[PDB]
Ligand binder design. Structure first.
Ligand SMILES: [Zn+2]
Length: 46
């Protein structure tokens, strides 16, 4: 058949923390640092 029913979001890199997608890894890896607390909280509320 085919690997990827959906049309868009066909990037080889997909974040598992949120569910994002990046064409290149460098982008993902970098976008991952955001999940590892890399900014001062504020308006956040759990
Ligand atoms: Zn993410």
């Amino acid at each position: 058949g085919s690997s990827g029913s959906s049309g868009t979001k066909e990037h080889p890199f997909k974040c598992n923390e949120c569910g994002k997608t990046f064409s290149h890894s460098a982008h993902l890896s970098k976008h991952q640092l955001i999940h590892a607390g890399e900014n001062p909280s504020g308006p956040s509320s759990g």
